[PDB]
Symmetry: C2
Subunit: 274 residues, 2 copies
């Protein structure tokens, strides 16, 4: 009536809801990585890299990939950063299998970061677009790479790497049918990682899109996004509700619900909009 | 009645879409020919400097961005190694060169290409894209336009355009106003495009062999294979169908398949 104050409150409830969902995803990720990092089939492959042991290991990772769905790759890299084992998974089809396409990944920052981790420490590099030989993969694939150095008798043997597939995950989590909000994902430095609007994505990397930065678009609301854990602002052309979460990597990840005046107007609505 | 009225509207829609594919084929023929006879390809072949490579890649990138339907434009040498490769991504509109250049000599489209005359434009049947023999995911069915390029009657290699069947079907196969979803079925009986991803490519993906029009509608398939535009209603599904030749010589079948529940608007 009264609609801005009440939409805001709805949107904050949705952000709390969704942050709890990413929290749970994070927990699953830690569990899977830890089981994979300690499996006998991995240790067998490390001791004796036979075609047979490799097959057992790939078969396990493919099963896990089909079961869990959020990993578009699962890899073992050696101490030099060269891929030794590689499973790819495609969520549209549900197909998982091995690849013989194996690259030197040592120039990548996520590898350089993985090296700094303790043996068996599970962490992640910020969300970043996938690449092949330094070239962007298309369609564009933002990924959160789970990194775990693997040791035998406390000697480091390589790195387990899981590419969690941020497009898939935002599709799964960021639209809420009942409350009908589209949550967008905004990086620690203001660029878009996920949105129903594909054109605003990845301004830090695609040069034509450098102007799609929350601080540029909202240059007075941005400081609150950075500082506060959650709040909202009404401009009043847009209602913006925001929150931050830690999603595996140490970088804050911002959750944004951004509604035009026109979208705020429709929200005198009914449950036949199911 | 209803099934019969819906049948006629489907047939109108199929002839509409047939005409769109006909027009697309004409575009393709004309662009391919222009590219095969271009100054910039000519200059690069005669003198493959990086300056000439740059000029060519820039040309092919702007053609990709202009035309939208090619997901790659390549030059392969006579031994089937890629020398020039432009990728295009229609969702972003981004086109650009790749340095990921492969030996494509084991591929059937390449062996087919080798069989063509100099300056002849033909096409290989629709086939999923691969990287070192491994399927590209997301799965990408492609219609490859092939043209051997020569100077002084000596073959220099092959211009290859990857026409991006997923893009094309998402563009042409749904019409909001009649509200029909046209599926593409291969001469094979296997599905090439459909709103239902899970039935696609039953010749290639294991565990999808049962998704063959001949298997699903054994007594309707002969009508489709005959290449005639018509329909059949089996009391549970109405199928309307027509066939076109889209660049290659093989017939491609356009299918509107509606269940009783869909029908039943
Ligand atoms: Na790379």
């Amino acid at each position: 009536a009264n609609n801005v104050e009440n939409t805001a409150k709805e949107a904050l409830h949705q952000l709390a809801y969704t942050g709890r969902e990413y929290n749970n995803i994070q927990d699953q990720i830690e569990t899977i990585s830890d089981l994979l990092g300690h499996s006998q089939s991995l240790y067998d492959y490390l001791r004796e890299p036979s075609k047979a042991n490799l097959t057992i290991l790939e078969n396990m990772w493919s099963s896990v990939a089909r079961n869990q769905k959020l990993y578009k790759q699962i890899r073992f890299l050696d101490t030099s950063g060269t891929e030794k084992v590689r499973i790819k998974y495609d969520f549209k089809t549900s197909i998982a299998g091995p690849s013989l396409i194996l690259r030197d990944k040592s120039a990548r920052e996520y590898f350089k970061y993985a090296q700094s981790l303790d043996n068996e420490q599970i962490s992640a590099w910020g969300i970043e677009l996938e690449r092949d030989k330094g070239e962007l993969v298309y369609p564009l694939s933002p990924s959160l790479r789970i990194l775990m150095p693997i040791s035998v008798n406390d000697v480091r043997q390589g790195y387990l790497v899981l590419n969690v597939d941020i497009e898939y995950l935002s599709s799964l989590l960021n639209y809420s049918p009942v409350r009908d909000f589209h949550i967008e994902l905004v990086k620690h430095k203001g660029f878009y990682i996920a949105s129903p609007d594909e054109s605003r994505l990845y301004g830090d990397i695609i040069p034509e899109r450098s102007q799609f930065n929350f601080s540029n678009m909202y240059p007075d609301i941005w400081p609150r996004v950075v500082s506060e854990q959650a709040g909202y602002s009404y401009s009043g052309e847009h209602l913006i509700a925001f929150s931050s979460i830690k999603f595996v990597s140490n970088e804050p990840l911002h959750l944004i619900i951004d509604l035009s005046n026109e979208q705020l107007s429709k929200r005198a609505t009914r449950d036949i909009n199911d």
